[PDB]
Chain A
Amino acid sequence: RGGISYDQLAKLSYEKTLRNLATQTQNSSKQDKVQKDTKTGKITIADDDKLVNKLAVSLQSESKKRYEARKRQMQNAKTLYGVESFINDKNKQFNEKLSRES
Chain B
Amino acid sequence: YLIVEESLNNVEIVRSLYTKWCSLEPGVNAWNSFVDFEIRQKNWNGVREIYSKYVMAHPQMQTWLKWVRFENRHGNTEFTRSVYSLAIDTVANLQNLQIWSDMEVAKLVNSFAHWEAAQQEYERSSALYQIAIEKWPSNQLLKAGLLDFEKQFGDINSIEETISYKRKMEYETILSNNAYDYDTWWLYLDLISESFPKQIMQTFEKAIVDSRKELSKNVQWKRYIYLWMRYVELELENSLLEEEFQRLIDDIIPHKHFTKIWLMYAKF
Interface residues of A (CB under 8 A from B): 7-8, 10-11, 14, 17-18, 21, 34, 45, 47-48, 51-52, 54-55, 58
Contacts and interface: CB of A to CB of B under 8 A. Distances in A.
4 A-B pairs with the lowest CB-CB distances in the bound complex, closest first:
A55-B7, A17-B3, A11-B29, A51-B8
Given A17-B6, A34-B12, A51-B8, 4 more contacts: A17-B3, A18-B3, A51-B7, A58-B7
B27 A7 contact: yes
B9 interface: yes
Interface of B: 2-4, 6-10, 12-13, 27, 29, 33, 40
A10 B8 CA distance: 20
Contacts of B6: 17-18, 21
A97 B10 CA distance: 46
B3 A11 contact: no
B13 to A, nearest CB: 8
B10 A45 contact: yes
Contacts of A11: 29, 33
Contacts, number: 32
A7 B29 contact: yes
A19 B29 CA distance: 17
The SS class assigned to the A binding surface is helix
Contacts of B3: 14, 17-18, 21
Nearest to A52: B8
Contacts of A8: 29
A45 B9 CA distance: 12
A14 B2 contact: yes
A62 to B, nearest CB: 11
A54 B7 contact: yes
Contacts of B27: 7
18 contacts: A7-B29, A8-B29, A11-B29, A14-B3, A14-B33, A17-B6, A18-B6, A18-B40, A21-B3, A21-B6, A34-B12, A34-B13, A45-B10, A47-B8, A51-B7, A51-B8, A52-B8, A54-B7
A7 B28 CA distance: 10
Contacts of A48: 8
A52 B2 CA distance: 14
B14 to A, nearest CB: 11
